[PDB]
Amino acid sequence: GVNDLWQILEPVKQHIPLRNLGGKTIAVNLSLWVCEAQTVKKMMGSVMKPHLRNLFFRISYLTQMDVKLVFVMEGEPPKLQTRYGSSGKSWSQKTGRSHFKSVLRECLHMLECLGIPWVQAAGEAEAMCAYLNAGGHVDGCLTNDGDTFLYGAQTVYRNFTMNTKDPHVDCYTMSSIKSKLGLDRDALVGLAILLGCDYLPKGVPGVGKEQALKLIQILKGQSLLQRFNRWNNEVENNIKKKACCCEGFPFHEVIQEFLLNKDKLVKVIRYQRPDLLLFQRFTLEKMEWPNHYACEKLLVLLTHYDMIERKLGSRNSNQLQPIRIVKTRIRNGVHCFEIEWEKPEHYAMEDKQHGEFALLTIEEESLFEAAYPEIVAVYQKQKLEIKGKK
DNA sequence: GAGCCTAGCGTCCGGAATTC
DNA sequence: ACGATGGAGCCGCTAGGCTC
DNA sequence: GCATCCCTAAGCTCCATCG
DNA sequence: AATTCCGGATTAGGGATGC
Ligand SMILES: [Mg+2]
């Protein structure tokens, strides 16, 4: 968490709407989402836990945008005693941390119900995100604020929001940082050194406004030049650097903390079909969702998963079967079909007599045609029949 | 933060401020 | 017959107030 | 009978009642 | 300097009132 680093990286950031993330895989810092949900203050009298709710609806929206996800489960930080409130040990602090971990466990449970993979990070989640990105396992890393670039990530997405107007993420690519700003990974690390990180809150003595001028000065290397100083215009910025030298270079250990990679993968990242029964059970006992409501909310994820599998070329009997195409529709400028489906196993209906009429979705024409070309074919046949009739 | 539920709009064109 | 003017319902989008 | 002045709507799509 | 707005302008109807 460098002070003012995002401001430094602002000229490179690009406003990217969420729909434009289709076909991309993103690692998600689950902890940041859970804390963000904890920050909600509106529902004072009825503060139902929005950690699970926001997680689910974000997952649903991104899934409908053809965005696959893998969630990173935070581990233990490597480094942390003033015998005050400042020390993390305290009943309210400890028990609160236990509650946070419990919420994380529940979120993991819902991820398993949805069939979405989650990995285990050794330490900070950001490190595992950058590990997935650098390893080609994901296309981007989603974080409101973090040192993901310092852990070696190439692409970072920021400021996620689902506002009806302007759903977007601010994108930061490493290549455009090295080209437009001329900042390599080591340059970012050293910038985090003089400006301070989540480990070091101090931005002083270096003002930081002239550190960019130092980066303009030297083009070859960054950290090595901080190294020769231990053996030790230019004299003046080096004088402020001397004000940093009286500190004694305690941040070297932080450097090697950023550069060392401890994260590993135990199992291949895999996606499974959402479990309708397990999802009804979980949402019922954890969020007090009626079974019919949980089914109604999960239907779009079931249809999306099955359509994806059929497009991949694998078809099984357990997949959902469309009864018919009702009519063509348009959703946010996208051409879609209104699909009436057949009632799947363990699906709960609100209306006893008409629930089977109620089973309905709206799917993108492209993906639905890839999944059920026969259904699309008979619909287009009926359209040829109406145009031929008149 | 996101969803749910309700309401109401729905023309063309050009100067305008400064890219939802 | 005919088809034409209705007209009521619906559709897609946006906004506001309240709920989970 | 026709003119004047002001206000308001302005999407699409079936069916249906009417000349 | 360029691409979103919104304020004014269109066109057509309807109603109340005036010649
Ligand atoms: Mg973390």
Numbering used by the authors: 2 to 81, 91 to 242, 310 to 467
Pull text from the paper.
In order to structurally characterize human GEN1, we crystallized the catalytically inactive variant GEN12-505 D30N, denoted GEN1 for simplicity, in complex with an immobile Holliday junction having arm lengths of 10 bp. The structure was determined experimentally and refined up to 3.0 Å resolution with an Rfree of 0.25. The HJ crystallized bridging between two protein monomers in the asymmetric unit. The overall structure of GEN1 resembles the shape of a downwards-pointing right hand with a 'thumb' extending out from the 'palm' and the DNA is packed against the ball of the thumb. The palm contains the catalytic core, which is formed by intertwined XPG-N and XPG-I domains. Notably, a small globular domain (residues 390–464) was found extending the GEN1 nuclease core at the wrist (pink). The domain has a chalice-shaped structure with three antiparallel β-strands packed against a C-terminal α-helix and it forms a characteristic aromatic cage. The GEN1-HJ structure revealed that the upstream DNA-binding interface acts as a docking site for double-stranded DNA and that the chromodomain secures its position. The DNA is bound at the upstream interface and the hydrophobic wedge but does not extend into the active site or to the downstream interface.
